[PDB]
Amino acid sequence: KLPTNLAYERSIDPSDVCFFVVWPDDRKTPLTYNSRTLLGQMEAKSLAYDVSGQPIKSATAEALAQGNPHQVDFCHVPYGASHIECSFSVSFSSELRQPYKCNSSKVKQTLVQLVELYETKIGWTELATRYLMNICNGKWLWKNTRKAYCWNIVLTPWPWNGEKVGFEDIRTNYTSRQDFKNNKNWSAIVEMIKTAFSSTDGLAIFEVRATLHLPTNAMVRPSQVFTEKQNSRVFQSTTIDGERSPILGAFKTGAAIATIDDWYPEATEPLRVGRFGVHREDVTCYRHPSTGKDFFSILQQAEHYIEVLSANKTPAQETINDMHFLMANLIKGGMFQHK
Amino acid sequence: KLPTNLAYERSIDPSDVCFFVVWPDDRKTPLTYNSRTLLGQMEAKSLAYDVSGQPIKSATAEALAQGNPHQVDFCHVPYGASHIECSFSVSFSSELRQPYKCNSSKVKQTLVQLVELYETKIGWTELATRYLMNICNGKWLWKNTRKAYCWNIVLTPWPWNGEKVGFEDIRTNYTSRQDFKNNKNWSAIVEMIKTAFSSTDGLAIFEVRATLHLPTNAMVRPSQVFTEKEAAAAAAAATQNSRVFQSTTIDGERSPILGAFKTGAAIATIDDWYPEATEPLRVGRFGVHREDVTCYRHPSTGKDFFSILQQAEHYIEVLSANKTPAQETINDMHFLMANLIKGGMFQHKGD
Amino acid sequence: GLAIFEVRATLHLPTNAMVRPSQVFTEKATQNSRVFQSTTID
DNA sequence: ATGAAGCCAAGGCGTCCTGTAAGGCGG
DNA sequence: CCGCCTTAC
């Protein structure tokens, strides 16, 4: 088990989310930001106090009132703009079928058999639904939908015949899972993702466009640059029409689509799928390898699930949840090696 | 047999896949990439397992949730671009007609005799079609065809009188060996390869150009550098760039190039004559599968190139009599010739 | 929970009255005082 | 051509920087 | 087939 060289490639492939300002003339310009400098108060605890004790001695009432200046990148909607338009593309492929590199003829045939038995026993409906549900509710916008009047999403899928798929105001209409299974096009686009995960060289491309209705020169929140050793809050950028634009990441938009994991020990809300089910808000790992619900404890029991998935029938709280998690990690993952 | 110095120059000499962006406003620019630092999570099995199970909680539930930053080269299609134009050149010749090295008049006259008898008894059609099928179906783009809408090949042959021979949407139109065979130029280009291999001082140049239609902001996958690298751990550079691209300067600005040997490796992925044969292999000595790390034609099967070349004097007295069976022996002759077409260190005995 | 307000105020000032916008925090000898924070409209 | 271009105060913290393969030589 | 073997800005 864990044969020193075991890799998988991506099965979901998102891109950068290019922002545009739409004017009432129905012309589009790339959204632009500016690095402005600002004055704040001395508000750090480790400026008035020492190591967990008392006031330093020199942080006096006058010294704590000197305003400290900082520099931030500032992206707002320009005044008199109609709305914001966000555009990107997703690709669903069958690359979870067999590992990219395996280095072991036994673990390969085990994992190929497990994906086959999963596909046959439990349909792709759950995972496909879960992934599509947060491409059509605009979770990939992250914080731009919060403090927004309305946002509408339009899918142009491929291969396709018919007119574009449309989701209107996604606050009143499309709240729950049953709201998505409604009028026309849902079943026809959940199918073709199952086909994309079923067929060898099976491909389903979607090109997503969203319209944000924000208040008067409202604040836009793109994806920020890590680069460390001044400018706090540096924005990730690309060049459109020879001018700089914020982009809202390629890896961040994959993280949003893959917030499908609410099978971890109990459940509260979906996490970004990983090995040690990490949560970002509280800085703990759920599915920590002590619980025996991490990926390397479940993957090393592949034969057990091969034994259970053969005969009737799987208990739909423990085994199916673990198999969902395993497939969810295979759709993402690489690299599953050890020593 | 197998003298202390025998060698060969490769017959197929490709070099590069230079990428260009084309805007609707039909003008070409070099495709550019940027170094991008990104924040992953602690996902390696090594960080939460020593040997072979759990460590004492140094890798605690908090310590496994600290975001690990890395740096990667990121290349994608710029917004508002029509498609990617991929430029690439091949030159087929006849170096397989003579050993590059010396030291055995017997083996030298045996190999040139075998090439001549092979040529006459079973023509270059099989290897030529195999080498041209993967040049005209975008095998040399490697992964850029996957998750693409459409791609079209246009190759300018030489020496040639007529028009640039073109292959439309390949995913649908040109799937099987037959689909490539029933357009009006296939014969002529297979024949000028056969000419190149059969004739002395033979030359067949193909200037290939692939139009590739990718989705919005779609990611480009060029070739990557090797770079044996280590100074120490704390700290040469917190950054240490993972996934560095092989690049060249076009029109004064850097662009990813998708290798030259990598392109050559794509064309010579024809070998499906090995003991089991599911998929075609990179023509080599030990029929090594790079992914799924093993060797079909291991030198214990007795089907590697050094076992097969030691039955050359055998194949002379089988290509003379009538008639060579469609079973393994034609495949062995094909594999031997495919190796004379690429290789040139047929020496072992130490080297 | 969410509540969005669009607030509009109308100032009636005397003739050629001075408007007092935000001032820029500057890098920093040449002369310059009172640099204003600005945006692009029309 | 006639002369001058003023000053004052400051510049936050927390956390991290992945892992696999890939010897010659004498005995 | 088996063990011996080092230092880096």
**Euclidean distance between CA atoms B261 and A8, whole angstroms:** 25
Give the span between the Cα atoms of B163 and A212, in whole angstroms: 51
Helix orientation angle between B328-342 and B312-319, rounded to the nearest 10 degrees? 120
Map A209-227 to HEC letters: EEEEECCCCCECCCCECCC
Q: Which residues of C touch A36 (CB under 8 A)?
A: 37
Count CB-CB contacts under 10 A for residue A201: 10
Contact by Cβ (8 Å): B36, B207? no
Sorted by sequence, the CB contacts under 8 Å of residue B277 that are 6+ apart come out as none
- Residue B97 to residue B108: CA distance in whole angstroms: 10
Instruction: Name the nt closest to A41 by C-alpha to C1'.
Output: D12
Nucleotide nearest to B232 (CA to C1'): E8
Q: How far is CA A120 from CA A115, A130, A166, A192, A237, in A?
A: 9, 19, 31, 16, 44
Q: Is A146 close to C39, i.e. CB distance below 8 A?
A: no
Cβ atoms within 10 Å of A6's Cβ, excluding its own: 24
Contact flag for C and B (3+ C-beta pairs < 8 Å): no
Give all strands of the β-sheet with B18-22 in edge-to-edge order: B28-30, B18-22, B83-93, B203-213, B150-158, B165-167
Give A38's contacts in chain C (Cβ within 8 Å): 25
User: Of the candidates B52, B61, B215, which has its C-beta nearest A288's C-beta?
Assistant: B61
Question: For residue A22, which phi and psi values (nearest 5 degrees)?
Answer: -100, 125
For residue C33, give Cα distances in angstroms to A35, A75, A127, B319, C38: 21, 27, 61, 96, 16
Question: Looking at chain A, which subunits does it touch, using at least 3 CB pairs closer than 8 Å as the criterion?
Answer: B, C
Distances (CA, A) of A204 to A180, A257, A278, B212, B317: 19, 15, 29, 17, 55
- CA nearest B96: which of B15, B206, B160, B13? B13
Which sign, positive or negative, has the C-alpha torsion A171, A172, A177, A179? negative
- Give nucleotides in strand D with any atom < 7 A to a protein C-beta: 5-7, 9-21
Q: Which residue has the tokens 């864990």?
A: A2
The answer to whether A222 and A163 have CB atoms below 8 angstroms apart is no
Residues B337 and B283: their CA atoms lie apart, in Å, by: 10
Provide the residue count of chain B. 351
Q: Which residues of C touch A147 (CB under 8 A)?
A: 2, 4
DSSP-derived letter for residue A142 is T
Nearest CA in chain C to A76: C39
Contact B76 A158 (CB under 8 A): no
Residue A237 structure tokens: 């950028």
Alpha-helical regions (H) of chain B = 105-121, 125-133, 177-181, 186-198, 261-267, 305-308, 312-319, 328-342
Dihedrals phi, psi of B334, to nearest 5 degrees: -55, -50
Interruptions in chain A after residues (C–N over 2.5 Å): 229
Structure tokens at B122: 């079973």
User: Do C41 and A80 lie within an 8 Å CB cutoff?
Assistant: yes
CB atoms within 10 A of CB A10: 19
Rounded to 10°, the helix A105-121/A302-310 angle is 40
CB-based contacts of A278, cutoff 8 Å, min separation 6: A271, A272, A285, A286, B41, B42, B64, B65
Interface test with C, best of A33, A36, A68, A76 (most C CBs within 10 A): A36
Which residue is the nearest neighbor of D18, CA to C1'? B44
Across the interface, whether the CB atoms of A78 and C39 are under 8 A apart is answered yes
In which residue are the tokens 């299974």 written?
A181
Contacts 24+ apart (CB under 8 A), A74-77: A74/A33, A74/A34, A74/A35, A74/A36, A75/A31, A75/A32, A75/A33, A75/A219, A75/A220, A75/A221, A75/A222, A75/A235, A75/A246, A76/A217, A76/A218, A76/A219, A76/A220, A77/A21, A77/A31, A77/A214, A77/A216, A77/A217, A77/A218, A77/A220
> A88, A71, A77, A256: which is closest to A156 by C-alpha?
A88
Q: Phi-psi category of B217—alpha, beta or left, where left has phi over 0 and alpha has psi -120 to 50?
A: left
Count the Cβ atoms, other than its own, within 10 Å of residue B206: 22
Write out the DSSP string of B230-290. Answer: -S-SSSS-S---BSPBPEEEETTEEEE---SHHHHHHHT--B--SSS-SS-B---SS-EET
Q: What residues of C are in the A interface, CB distance below 8 Å?
A: 2, 4, 6, 24-25, 37, 39-42
CA dihedral B259, B147, B271, B340 (to 10 degrees): -20
Q: How many Å apart are CA B326 and CA B330, to the nearest integer? A: 6
Chain B residues touching residue A337 (CB < 8 angstroms): 45
DSSP string, B64-93: GGS-EEEEEEE-BPPTT--EEEEEEEEEEE
**Could you check: is the Cβ of residue A46 within 7 Å of any atom of nucleic acid strand D?**
yes
Residue A52, Cβ density class (10 Å: 0-12 exposed, 13-18 middle, ≥19 buried): exposed
Which of A273, A268, A276 is CA-nearest to residue A258? A273
User: 3-class DSSP state for residue B142?
Assistant: coil
* A and B adjacent (3 or more CB pairs under 8 angstroms): yes
Identity of the residue numbered B222 = P
The Cα–Cα gap between B220 and B32 comes to 10
Strand A150-158 vs strand A165-167: parallel, antiparallel, or unpaired?
antiparallel
Q: Is A309 helix (H, G, I), strand (E, B) or coil?
A: helix
**Would the CB atoms of C6 and A37 count as touching at under 8 Å?**
no
- Please report, rounded to whole angstroms, the spatial distance between the CA atom of protein residue B100 and the C1' atom of nucleotide D18: 46
Return the HEC string of A36-87. EEEEECCCCHHHHECCCCCECCCCCCCHHHCCEEEEEEECECCCCCCEEEEE
**B219 and A250 in contact by Cβ < 8 A?**
yes
| Residue indicated by tokens 């062995």 | B332
Residue B232 CA distance to nucleotide E7 C1' (Å): 9
Q: Do C39 and A217 touch (CB under 8 A)?
A: yes
In angstroms, the CA A9 to CA A97 distance is 10
User: Residue-wise over A15-45: b if at least 16 C-beta within 10 A, else e?
Assistant: bbbbbbbbeeeeeeebbbbeeeebeeeeeee
Closest in A78, A146, A216 to C40, CB measured: A78
Cα gap A193→A259, rounded to integer Å: 17
The answer to whether the Cα torsion of B239, B245, B249, B253 is positive or negative is: negative
Distance C29 CA to D1 C1' (A): 27
**What is the rounded CA–CA span in Å between residue B47 and residue B40?**
14
Resolution in A: 2.9
- C-alpha pair distances (Å), B222 with each of A237, A312, B49: 22, 47, 34
Joined together, the tokens standing for residue A234 give 């540096």
Q: What values do phi and psi take at B187, rounded to 5?
A: -55, -55
Question: Which residue is closest to E7 in terms of CA–C1' distance?
Answer: B231
Q: Could you tell me if B148 and B77 are in contact, meaning their C-beta atoms sit under 8 angstroms apart?
A: no
- Grouping H, G, I as helix, E, B as strand and the rest as coil, residue A29 is strand
Q: What angle do CA B324, B327, B332 make, to 5 degrees?
A: 80
- What is the rounded CA–CA span in Å between residue A18 and residue A220? 13
At A329, list the tokens: 């990690």
Helix (H, G, I), strand (E, B) or coil at B206: strand
Which nucleotide's C1' atom has the smallest distance to the CA of B66? Answer: D16
Report the distance separating Cα A222 and Cα A143, nearest Å: 9
For residue A335, say if its preceding peptide bond is cis, omega within 30 degrees of 0: yes
Distance A225 CA to D11 C1' (A): 21
E-strand spans in chain A?
A: 12-13, 18-22, 28-30, 34-40, 68-74, 83-93, 150-158, 165-167, 203-213, 237-240, 243-246
Q: Cβ–Cβ of A18/B79 closer than 8 Å?
A: yes
Interchain CB distance below 8 Å, A79 and C41: yes
B78 CB and strand D closer than 7 A: no
CB A90, CB A13: distance < 8 Å: yes
Judged by CB atoms closer than 8 Å, whether chains meet at A108 and B76 is answered as no
Q: Is the distance from CB of B195 to CB of B218 less than 8 angstroms?
A: no
Q: Which residue is nearest to nucleotide D5 (CA to C1')?
A: C31
Between the CA of B299 and the C1' of E4, what is the distance in angstroms? 30
Please say whether the beta carbons of A284 and B65 come within 8 A.
Answer: yes
